[PDB]
Write an enzyme that holds these catalytic residues in place. Structure first.
Site, PDB file in Angstrom:
ATOM      1  N   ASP A  92      -4.697   3.572  -0.185  1.00  0.00           N
ATOM      2  CA  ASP A  92      -4.571   2.518  -1.177  1.00  0.00           C
ATOM      3  C   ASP A  92      -4.427   2.962  -2.630  1.00  0.00           C
ATOM      4  O   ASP A  92      -5.404   3.365  -3.251  1.00  0.00           O
ATOM      5  CB  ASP A  92      -5.792   1.596  -1.047  1.00  0.00           C
ATOM      6  CG  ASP A  92      -6.192   1.339   0.410  1.00  0.00           C
ATOM      7  OD1 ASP A  92      -6.668   2.289   1.088  1.00  0.00           O
ATOM      8  OD2 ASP A  92      -6.029   0.188   0.876  1.00  0.00           O
ATOM      9  N   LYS A 135      -1.098  -1.044  -5.200  1.00  0.00           N
ATOM     10  CA  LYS A 135       0.234  -1.624  -5.359  1.00  0.00           C
ATOM     11  C   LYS A 135       0.106  -3.118  -5.637  1.00  0.00           C
ATOM     12  O   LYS A 135       0.750  -3.647  -6.540  1.00  0.00           O
ATOM     13  CB  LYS A 135       1.070  -1.432  -4.090  1.00  0.00           C
ATOM     14  CG  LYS A 135       0.904  -0.093  -3.388  1.00  0.00           C
ATOM     15  CD  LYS A 135       1.712  -0.071  -2.103  1.00  0.00           C
ATOM     16  CE  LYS A 135       1.089   0.856  -1.081  1.00  0.00           C
ATOM     17  NZ  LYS A 135      -0.239   0.353  -0.631  1.00  0.00           N
ATOM     18  N   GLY A 140      -4.336  -4.436   3.081  1.00  0.00           N
ATOM     19  CA  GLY A 140      -5.326  -5.174   2.322  1.00  0.00           C
ATOM     20  C   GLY A 140      -5.185  -4.927   0.839  1.00  0.00           C
ATOM     21  O   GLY A 140      -5.721  -3.957   0.307  1.00  0.00           O
ATOM     22  N   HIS A 141      -4.413  -5.779   0.179  1.00  0.00           N
ATOM     23  CA  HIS A 141      -4.191  -5.664  -1.255  1.00  0.00           C
ATOM     24  C   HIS A 141      -5.268  -6.450  -2.001  1.00  0.00           C
ATOM     25  O   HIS A 141      -5.566  -7.583  -1.634  1.00  0.00           O
ATOM     26  CB  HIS A 141      -2.799  -6.201  -1.602  1.00  0.00           C
ATOM     27  CG  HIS A 141      -1.686  -5.504  -0.882  1.00  0.00           C
ATOM     28  ND1 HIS A 141      -0.512  -5.132  -1.504  1.00  0.00           N
ATOM     29  CD2 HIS A 141      -1.575  -5.096   0.404  1.00  0.00           C
ATOM     30  CE1 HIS A 141       0.272  -4.524  -0.632  1.00  0.00           C
ATOM     31  NE2 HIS A 141      -0.347  -4.486   0.530  1.00  0.00           N
ATOM     32  N   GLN A 150       2.119   0.405   2.834  1.00  0.00           N
ATOM     33  CA  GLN A 150       1.251   1.549   2.615  1.00  0.00           C
ATOM     34  C   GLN A 150       2.076   2.582   1.866  1.00  0.00           C
ATOM     35  O   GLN A 150       3.094   2.238   1.254  1.00  0.00           O
ATOM     36  CB  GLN A 150       0.759   2.087   3.956  1.00  0.00           C
ATOM     37  CG  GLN A 150      -0.029   1.056   4.754  1.00  0.00           C
ATOM     38  CD  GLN A 150      -0.288   1.482   6.183  1.00  0.00           C
ATOM     39  OE1 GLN A 150       0.454   1.118   7.093  1.00  0.00           O
ATOM     40  NE2 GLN A 150      -1.344   2.264   6.386  1.00  0.00           N
TER      41      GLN A 150
HETATM   42  N1  LIG Z   1     -10.529   0.983 -11.638  1.00  0.00           N
HETATM   43  C1  LIG Z   1      -9.315   0.596 -11.255  1.00  0.00           C
HETATM   44  N2  LIG Z   1      -9.145  -0.012 -10.068  1.00  0.00           N
HETATM   45  C2  LIG Z   1      -7.832  -0.343  -9.840  1.00  0.00           C
HETATM   46  C3  LIG Z   1      -6.736  -0.118 -10.659  1.00  0.00           C
HETATM   47  N3  LIG Z   1      -5.566  -0.602 -10.077  1.00  0.00           N
HETATM   48  C4  LIG Z   1      -5.987  -1.078  -8.953  1.00  0.00           C
HETATM   49  N4  LIG Z   1      -7.332  -0.972  -8.724  1.00  0.00           N
HETATM   50  C5  LIG Z   1      -8.131  -1.395  -7.565  1.00  0.00           C
HETATM   51  O1  LIG Z   1      -7.939  -0.402  -6.549  1.00  0.00           O
HETATM   52  C6  LIG Z   1      -7.806  -0.991  -5.262  1.00  0.00           C
HETATM   53  C7  LIG Z   1      -6.424  -0.577  -4.738  1.00  0.00           C
HETATM   54  O2  LIG Z   1      -6.358  -0.699  -3.309  1.00  0.00           O
HETATM   55  P1  LIG Z   1      -5.736  -2.037  -2.642  1.00  0.00           P
HETATM   56  O3  LIG Z   1      -5.314  -2.962  -3.757  1.00  0.00           O
HETATM   57  O4  LIG Z   1      -6.639  -2.508  -1.592  1.00  0.00           O
HETATM   58  O5  LIG Z   1      -4.437  -1.353  -1.948  1.00  0.00           O
HETATM   59  P2  LIG Z   1      -2.863  -1.565  -2.268  1.00  0.00           P
HETATM   60  O6  LIG Z   1      -2.390  -2.240  -0.957  1.00  0.00           O
HETATM   61  O7  LIG Z   1      -2.196  -0.262  -2.380  1.00  0.00           O
HETATM   62  O8  LIG Z   1      -2.773  -2.534  -3.369  1.00  0.00           O
HETATM   63  C8  LIG Z   1      -7.959  -2.483  -5.494  1.00  0.00           C
HETATM   64  O9  LIG Z   1      -9.260  -2.899  -5.139  1.00  0.00           O
HETATM   65  C9  LIG Z   1      -7.644  -2.710  -6.981  1.00  0.00           C
HETATM   66  O10 LIG Z   1      -8.212  -3.880  -7.627  1.00  0.00           O
HETATM   67  C10 LIG Z   1      -6.927   0.534 -11.920  1.00  0.00           C
HETATM   68  O11 LIG Z   1      -6.086   0.809 -12.764  1.00  0.00           O
HETATM   69  N5  LIG Z   1      -8.274   0.860 -12.137  1.00  0.00           N
END
Ligand SMILES: Nc1nc2c(ncn2[C@@H]2O[C@H](COP(=O)(O)OP(=O)(O)O)[C@@H](O)[C@H]2O)c(=O)[nH]1
Ligand SMILES: Nc1nc2c(ncn2[C@@H]2O[C@H](COP(=O)(O)OP(=O)(O)O)[C@@H](O)[C@H]2O)c(=O)[nH]1
Lengths: 432, 432
Positions: free
Chosen positions: A20, A23, A47-48, A231
């Protein structure tokens, strides 16, 4: 820095590492500028995590992150796999949080079906295997894509013909039984499955639509479309660290096979590169930090399973893999996320070169794990910083050592950085 | 009409119908203008037929059709599946016909392995099924791609580590046994397989190379590359007439996932459209001609299995499917093949519209076979001609009724025709 209005008719966000990278956050920010946001691969296994204006937490699975905007249509392409029971549960959870979904989500008629069957089968596989451990990761993703390849699996269009759905479903039920003794397939259990999805077909019906036609028609009408990557490409079935990968194609090629759009029509491709790498589960990890440095990242970034709470392995940013990934997809720009997590580190290393077990520099990223699990990484230490940047909105406001960081990356990677994440919030994004 | 020199850095030839449209012929003609010709999907299950200057017949399986030109490098991408025994047999057959292969063929280290195992397994499947019939089509293509999706299959890189190859091969051997009772897996039979491929690894070694890196590096050095499509997109695992399709992705997206190149780098895409459709095997066939008109085509075109001699079902050119296919791939031009076969026909119909069982015009090509197998095709009869054109080399020399034919096609399809095949020979091609 009008990056939001620079994007083409058909743009897309792709993960460039493992696990993750965040994205979804980017997709949520860029979504209001697009007419359609579509998921081209994978299932609910992902899971975004995104946050609205009020700071409300949202955890999507199948539904694209653009679902929080009224004038945006979410689409689940043909490359996806749908576990109908879990899907509706996800819908119900959104409807209760004031988010309507009626007429705002399309479900590809050509998308395959992930039944509870695949879930139990997936589990049976590990139970007898070398014994993969502890985790209710009953994601029947692997087996479902197998049924697809085998061509004996069912698709969304089948729910419109429940008549034949019966004798089409029992076929893979019979198959699974022949394989595992831990499966008997009662003729009575089949009766239910039919009557279960017969009811599901009633509810899902208004969502179904010719995904391929709709999307293509949209392009002819100049409707902007943003593709949400499932992913990362290092997890790709072909390009990833096989066999430790997913059965889906998270790479750019996958958006074509998963949505049904011409390679020539795909414009900009933003590659989400986290400031540090995180691999969830066993597999090759060159830049892996087993020491305190890893523990610092893990806690600060909150690298733990959203459901399992298990700590994701961490490490330094791997430029070798990144550069290799950049070529494969052809990223126009990059989104360097979680930069705020590197705060406090006196030194921040970058994996630049790859040496053999003896000392020979490799020209390219290793395919086989045999050679990959036995490499000597060549780092490049850079000046760190001790400053909470989760508040910095402008680029110039960043520390000199932090700016130097993104710049060294975009230099080695070859692709510029247009977005820098310094917080999970929708607002916490810097434009370069 | 310098079509040969109009093609981009990275071009590709794709089949737009079902079965064999004669892509190989085109690839052979265009090959000398390219530095590399690469196969991105499928296995030896295909079979391209090309002829040299002297008129010598060549039937390729895995090897790209550009193999007949010295300054051309053939590449078997990561998307492919290699049945090593059959591969070497194909190599030996080329070496005896004066065609050297040493240093002129690359084999993707990330390409999966198709063992005799998959072949026997493939057969076991039909033996118990509704009983698909008569045909030694023991092409373990389906099962191999399954092993891939399952992530328990082996790849070309594994042959470099025969140490672990043993315990990596027995795993899917054990699997297959658990499934079919018609498989016992002797521990002695395993010993052989290891020592067999241990010898194969010795011979294949000089062919192996990082396909992804090589190709991408090639593009950076401005080396022209022509991609050879395996089969047609109507046979695509996602877009084709499921379930009657192949487990591979013959569409454009597949050249990305099969070669490892960026969607932005793919230039021109020539879609091979045969003058009439031919579907090999059971499945939906709208334009199918069961009458004499079909028999005339079949004999003239020689629509019979190269090995099985079985007659391929025939019919009129389906523009509905073609147009739908054109969108999916984004063809720059088209190669209208086997035009010489239409000679003698007083009338030549074209499938333009698709009506429902009741009489409702469909806006798009049907996904599910349920609706597709029950359609009312709306033809458009055109003036035929009685003239042997297997000698016409210039465009203007064609009959007025024949020229009107290609023109009506390129009009309805939207994409122009740049190549018109009027014979199997390398020389028998007209440039428009
Ligand atoms: N601290 C921090 N958390 C972030 C940032 N960008 C994203 N996140 C968090 O990192 C996690 C990213 O994993 P997730 O969103 O589940 O996977 P994705 O499918 O690749 O979006 C999420 O819980 C976001 O809210 C950032 O710049 N800083
Ligand atoms: N009569 C005729 N035969 C052709 C023409 N172009 C190609 N062919 C033959 O038609 C067959 C097409 O199938 P093949 O080339 O094996 O399949 P591909 O994989 O699609 O190339 C080959 O035997 C060709 O030599 C043409 O213009 N006229």
């Amino acid at each position: 820095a009008d990056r939001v209005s620079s994007l083409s008719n058909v743009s897309g966000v792709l993960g460039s590492q493992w696990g993750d990278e965040g994205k979804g956050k980017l997709v949520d920010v860029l979504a209001p500028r697009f007419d359609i946001v579509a998921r081209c691969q994978g299932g609910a296994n992902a899971g975004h995590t995104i946050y609205n204006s009020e700071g409300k937490k949202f955890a999507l699975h199948l539904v694209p992150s653009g679902i929080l905007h009224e004038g945006t249509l979410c689409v689940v392409g043909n490359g996806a796999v749908i576990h109908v029971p879990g899907f509706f549960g996800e819908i119900d959870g959104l409807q209760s949080n004031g988010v309507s979904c009626d007429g705002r989500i399309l479900v590809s008629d050509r998308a395959h079906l992930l039944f509870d069957l695949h879930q139990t089968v997936d589990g049976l596989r590990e139970a007898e295997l070398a014994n993969s451990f502890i985790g209710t990761t009953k994601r029947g993703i692997g087996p479902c894509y197998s049924s697809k390849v085998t061509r004996n699996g069912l698709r969304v269009c089948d729910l419109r013909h429940m008549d034949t759905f019966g004798d089409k479903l029992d076929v893979l039920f019979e198959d699974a039984a022949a394989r595992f003794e831990g499966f008997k397939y009662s003729k009575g259990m089949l009766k239910e499955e039919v009557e279960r999805y017969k009811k599901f077909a009633e509810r899902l019906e208004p969502f179904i639509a010719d995904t391929v036609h709709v999307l293509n028609e949209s392009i002819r009408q100049k409707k902007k479309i943003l593709v949400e990557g499932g992913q990362a490409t290092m997890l790709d079935i072909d390009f990833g660290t096989y066999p430790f990968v997913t059965s889906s194609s998270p790479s750019a090629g996958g958006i074509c096979t998963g949505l049904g759009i011409a390679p020539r029509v795909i414009g900009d491709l933003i590659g989400v590169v986290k400031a540090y790498t995180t691999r969830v589960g066993s597999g090759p990890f060159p830049t892996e930090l087993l020491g305190e440095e890893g523990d610092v990242l893990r806690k600060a970034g909150m690298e733990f399973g959203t459901t399992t709470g298990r700590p994701r392995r961490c490490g330094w940013l791997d430029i070798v893999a990144l550069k290799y990934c950049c070529d494969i997809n052809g990223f126009s720009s990059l989104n360097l996320t979680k930069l705020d997590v590197l705060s406090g580190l006196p030194e921040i290393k970058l994996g630049v070169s790859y040496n053999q077990m003896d000392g020979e520099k490799l020209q390219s990223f290793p395919g086989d794990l045999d050679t990959l699990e036995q490499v000597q990484v060549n780092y490049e230490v850079l000046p760190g910083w001790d400053s909470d940047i989760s508040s910095v909105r402008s680029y110039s406001e960043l520390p000199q050592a932090a700016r130097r960081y993104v710049e060294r990356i975009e230099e080695l990677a070859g692709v510029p950085v247009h977005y820098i994440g310094v917080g999970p919030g929708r607002d916490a994004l810097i434009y370069k």
